């Protein structure tokens, strides 16, 4: 009956996890996803697959990559004329077309350079597992729902009735245009929860093709914590996508994008900590302890372990 309600803010640059995290809340704490709710995502997964492939097809022209196998030019022309908005089925010839494209070394080499254009971070996850998706009785798994991509806009609040307290978490859009709207959720904020894609260290924004994504996230975090609305607010910092860092850090070197890095190459742990340091260290206009956490928002158990802790930190301070 008489529960207290606290209001948390999911803030970050675009494509960092905010919405995914919210799903994990809905799974762990919220109502979850019934098999009914999963069929709603089937269209979205189909669209993702096209979008991802069309992105790579344009990138073959942009980056000037030859299609290894001749007949894929025909497949390439088939998939690129599709309007993804009107997609609601994954039947032939498109299933075989995209599979045939995904198999092409030229398309694979284009994937190896996804840094140089805008490609989603669930593309390999989906495009490898096409057979399960092509299936005409296909029902997306819980992980399929987590990996799906749907850009957020405006200000959405999601309450979660946890036993002791209710968390009105407010998901927002991360892109630059969206940040103008953020002020209309700044009143009476218990805690800010900032998400940062650890993987974005060598990537440039969608809205700006010449500016580094982490440089922006970093800069955004430093600004946002020193705002009048957040005097009496804790600041949890989620450094997300740790799995992608471990994966990427083998070939792309952090030294090349942040020249004030002193640790060794191909070491994921050293790099994630540098990035944590970058965000919190040497801040003259900040005096609040920041409770960082290395998250992977697509890993239900990691988030179940992580957030249950963040809860005990928030309630303690209130």
């Amino acid at each position: 009956d008489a529960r207290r309600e606290l209001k948390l803010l999911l803030l970050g640059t675009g494509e960092s996890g905010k919405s995914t995290f919210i799903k994990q809340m809905r799974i762990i704490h919220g109502s979850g996803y019934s098999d009914e709710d999963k069929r709603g995502f089937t269209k979205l997964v189909y669209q993702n697959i096209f979008t991802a492939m069309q992105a790579m097809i344009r990138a073959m022209d942009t980056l000037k990559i030859p299609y290894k196998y001749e007949h894929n030019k025909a497949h390439a022309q088939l998939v690129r004329e599709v309007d993804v908005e009107k997609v609601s089925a994954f039947e032939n010839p498109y299933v075989d077309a995209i599979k045939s494209l995904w198999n092409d070394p030229g398309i694979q080499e284009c994937y190896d350079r996804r840094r140089e254009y805008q490609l989603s971070d669930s593309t390999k996850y989906y495009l490898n597992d096409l057979d399960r998706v092509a299936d005409p009785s296909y029902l997306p798994t819980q992980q399929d729902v987590l990996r799906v991509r749907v850009p957020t806009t405006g200000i959405i609040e999601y309450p979660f009735d946890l036993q002791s307290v209710i968390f009105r978490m407010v998901d927002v859009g991360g892109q630059r245009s969206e940040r103008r709207k953020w002020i209309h959720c700044f009143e009476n904020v218990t805690s800010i929860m900032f998400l940062v894609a650890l993987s974005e260290y060598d990537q440039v924004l969608v809205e700006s093709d010449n500016e580094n994504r982490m440089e922006e996230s970093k800069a955004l975090f430093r600004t946002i914590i020193t705002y009048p609305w957040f005097q009496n607010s804790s600041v949890i910092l989620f450094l997300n996508k740790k799995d992608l860092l471990e994966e990427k850090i083998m070939y792309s070197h952090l030294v090349d994008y942040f020249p004030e890095y002193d640790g060794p190459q191909r070491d994921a742990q050293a790099a994630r900590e540098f990035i944590l340091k970058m965000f919190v260290d040497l801040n003259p206009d900040s005096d609040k302890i920041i409770y960082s956490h290395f998250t992977c928002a697509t890993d239900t158990e990691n988030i179940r372990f992580v957030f249950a802790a963040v809860k005990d930190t928030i309630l303690q301070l209130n």
Partner: protein, 749 residues
């Protein structure tokens, strides 16, 4: 897949009908056609003179049973039961529900009327056609001239003078400069009257110093040319809605801007270098891409899966009445006209039938008004209910039939005439229990829902049981969404000013119907916005009276594909949220907006030299509602008035989804020219033509305004600097880290 209007070949080449007439009994064999673009239904009748019907003015097409039958036996002698009536077509068209004319045709051929009727309707109710670009409405005028020709096929000059009758001395000098004929007594070969030449006639007729000004503004000091990137930067920076995501709604790429040059620029010397001229730019301004609205708005692109109480519903009060309350006609046609126009709640004041036939009939509370039998009204609903919208139609009864024999009859009349549509038991998913929400519009598609009092007519009631409202406390105690209550205007106003928030909360689960006070004897309307602000769904109005109030209603319900249902704002639906409808300051969670409407110019606004002024009003929450703005009346010019005006600001729109901008032009004296309702949350930014509309929201052709809108998200005064840093943090933090690094040596230690 909202496809544009296509005229099938049967309508292009045409078919032979005999246009007959109830009144004068004029039999004329004619060939009905439709022009390629689908603007006009036309036919040659008397001797050789061409009649045109403007398809945008078509309200309904009827065939078979529903085609008006010839009462006069003299005509019916010339004509000739089932297969005879199979080839009848009645076209209904008019500027409002009340004033409609009927054009009865009959085909000579078999099952031909059904193709014309159905296709004429498809064109008449087409959405892109109603929301056509400015250039398309200009091309519609070109067509009308090329259609209506004399008996020897030529375009007479005196129609070009009729169309542009404002300054006929200018139209003469316009036509001479093109090389066309300019005397009132002579005509022009269709051959010689090219669209390209008509396009040049328009240019020389009306100078665009406003568009010249806009070209200087953008950049081109050397004005007669414009680079591709310039256009791109203009389109991306000035013509783009800034409330939108850069990923979901990307900016224009140069390749896309190239396709716009090829689409519009006439000069091949500019086009070869990827550049644009005033002509091409002016063409683009009124182009298919540069509308004031995005298609989504107009399209049926709203969620329809929410409970029925979560929607504003288009509603009629005493639908049967055509003019007055106390004395006036009772028409069955109005039910047709209401439902065809997207009304989803129509009222029926049923009364106890006399002892000869014992037939239930409809009329006003024993006033000086005529009568129509119930049986007929139900047949009219059956016909038109879902003709323009697949979503449920609530039947607002007002039963004054206390005889059991007629009660069982009118229930049969409902059962037999509607059949499968009529919802008689509750659905499996939504029982009539406590704690159950109403079914969604989606779930009740193609269902008639009766709203009648209880304790045979009651057993039909299920999801809309009316009850005598005690209080918002008593309603919450019960927690039954299937129950609802109607409220007379003044009693609704009482609950509005006293219990505004409890009203919203009530409306989150259950339905409130609202009708005008009984003292509005001349069918006067109350502002429906007043009760949409507290979430009232069924705000009933008099459709016969097209004042400002109905203009709004008709205007706003257009959106969401003329479905009749409009989704309420998030905070007026969600149980866990709450806010004060009388709030004078922004609500947290709701992104407020700020609007900047500026009236630049207007073209072909009236058919006689007169001064013209333009109003800019907003309708929303009381804090949003500001309706006192007005331009200065132009100096007796109607062709191309150019208002050198200060911008009309709306600095804080608290709840933009509820907010609706209204732009209306008037003659000096106050005579209505044309209006437009634009949803504030959807309206675009930069320079756009606002093609004006009549009071019943029918698209007018030539009267259009040019406006400059700015519609961004709201930023308070003190928090302007803070916002800039959220939008571009690298800049701010970069300076701070530089300042500190410049102080490096000086600190030391």
């Amino acid at each position: 897949q909202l496809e544009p209007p296509t005229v099938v070949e049967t309508l292009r080449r045409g078919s032979k009908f005999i246009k007959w007439d109830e009144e004068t009994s004029s039999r004329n064999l004619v060939t009905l056609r439709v022009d390629p673009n689908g603007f006009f239904l036309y036919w040659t009748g008397p001797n050789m003179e061409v009649d045109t019907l403007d398809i945008s003015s078509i309200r309904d097409t009827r065939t078979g049973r529903y085609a008006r039958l010839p009462k006069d036996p003299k005509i019916r002698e010339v004509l000739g039961d089932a297969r005879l009536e199979e080839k009848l077509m009645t076209v209904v068209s008019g500027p409002d529900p009340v004033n409609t004319v009927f054009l009865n045709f009959m085909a000579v051929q078999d099952d031909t009327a059904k193709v014309w009727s159905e296709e004429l309707f498809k064109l008449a109710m087409n959405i892109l056609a109603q929301n056509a670009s400015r250039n398309t409405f200009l091309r519609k005028a070109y067509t009308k001239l090329k259609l209506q020709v004399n008996q020897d096929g030529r375009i007479p000059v005196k129609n070009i003078l009729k169309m542009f009758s404002a300054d006929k001395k200018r139209v003469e000098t316009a036509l001479e400069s093109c090389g066309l004929k300019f005397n009132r007594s002579e005509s022009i070969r269709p051959d010689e009257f090219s669209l390209e030449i008509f396009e040049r006639f328009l240019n020389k007729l009306c100078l665009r110093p406003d568009i010249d000004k806009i070209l200087l503004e953008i950049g081109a000091k050397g004005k007669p040319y414009l680079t591709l990137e310039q256009l791109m930067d203009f389109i991306n920076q000035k013509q783009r809605d800034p409330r939108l995501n850069e990923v979901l709604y990307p900016p224009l790429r140069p390749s896309q801007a190239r396709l716009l040059i090829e689409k519009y620029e006439p000069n091949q010397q500019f086009l070869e270098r990827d550049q644009m001229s005033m002509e091409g730019f002016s063409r683009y301004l009124g182009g298919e891409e540069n509308g004031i609205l995005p298609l989504e708005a107009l399209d049926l692109s709203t969620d329809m899966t929410q409970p029925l109480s979560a929607y504003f519903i288009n509603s009629s009060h005493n639908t049967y009445l055509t003019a007055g309350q106390l004395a006036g006609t009772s028409s069955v046609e109005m039910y047709r006209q209401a439902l065809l126009w997207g009304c989803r709640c129509v009222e029926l004041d049923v009364w106890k039938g006399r002892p000869p036939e014992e037939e239930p009939f409809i009329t006003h509370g024993f006033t000086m008004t005529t009568e129509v039998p119930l049986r007929d009204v139900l047949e009219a609903i059956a016909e038109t209910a879902f003709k323009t919208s697949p979503y449920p139609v609530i039947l607002s009864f007002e039963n004054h039939v206390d005889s059991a024999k007629q009660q069982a009859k009118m229930a049969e009349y409902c059962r037999s005439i509607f059949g499968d549509a009529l919802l008689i038991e509750p659905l499996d998913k939504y029982p009539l229990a406590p704690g159950v929400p109403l079914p969604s519009p989606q779930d009740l598609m193609g269902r008639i829902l009766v709203k009648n009092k209880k304790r045979e007519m009651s057993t039909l009631v299920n999801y809309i049981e009316p009850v005598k409202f005690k209080s918002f406390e008593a309603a919450r105690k019960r927690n039954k969404c299937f129950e609802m209550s109607s409220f007379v205007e003044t009693k609704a106003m009482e609950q509005l000013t006293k219990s505004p928030m409890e009203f919203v909360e009530y409306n989150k689960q259950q339905l409130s119907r609202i009708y005008p006070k009984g003292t509005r004897v001349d069918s006067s309307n109350y502002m429906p916005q007043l009760f949409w602000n507290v979430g009232c769904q069924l705000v009933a109005l008099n459709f016969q009276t097209l004042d400002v109030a109905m203009q709004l209603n008709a205007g706003v319900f257009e959106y969401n594909g003329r479905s009749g249902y409009l989704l309420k704002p998030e905070f007026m639906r969600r149980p866990d949220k709450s806010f004060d409808p009388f709030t004078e300051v922004i609500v947290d969670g709701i992104v407020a907006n700020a609007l900047r409407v500026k009236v630049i110019s207007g073209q072909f606004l009236s058919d006689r030299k007169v001064g013209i002024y333009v109003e800019v009003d907003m309708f929303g929450l009381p804090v949003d509602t500001r309706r006192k703005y007005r331009t200065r009346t132009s100096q007796g010019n109607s062709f191309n008035p150019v208002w050198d005006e200060e911008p009309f600001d709306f600095p804080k729109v608290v709840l933009p989804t509820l907010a609706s901008l209204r732009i209306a032009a008037f003659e000096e004296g106050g005579k209505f020219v044309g209006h437009r309702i634009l949803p504030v949350s959807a309206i675009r930014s930069g320079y756009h033509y606002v093609c004006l509309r009549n009071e019943a929201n029918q698209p007018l052709c030539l009267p259009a305004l040019l406006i400059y809108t700015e519609a961004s998200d709201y930023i308070p005064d003190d928090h302007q600097d803070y916002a800039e840093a959220l939008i571009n943090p690298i800049k701010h933090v970069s300076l701070m880290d530089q300042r500190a690094r410049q102080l490096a040596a000086l600190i030391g230690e």
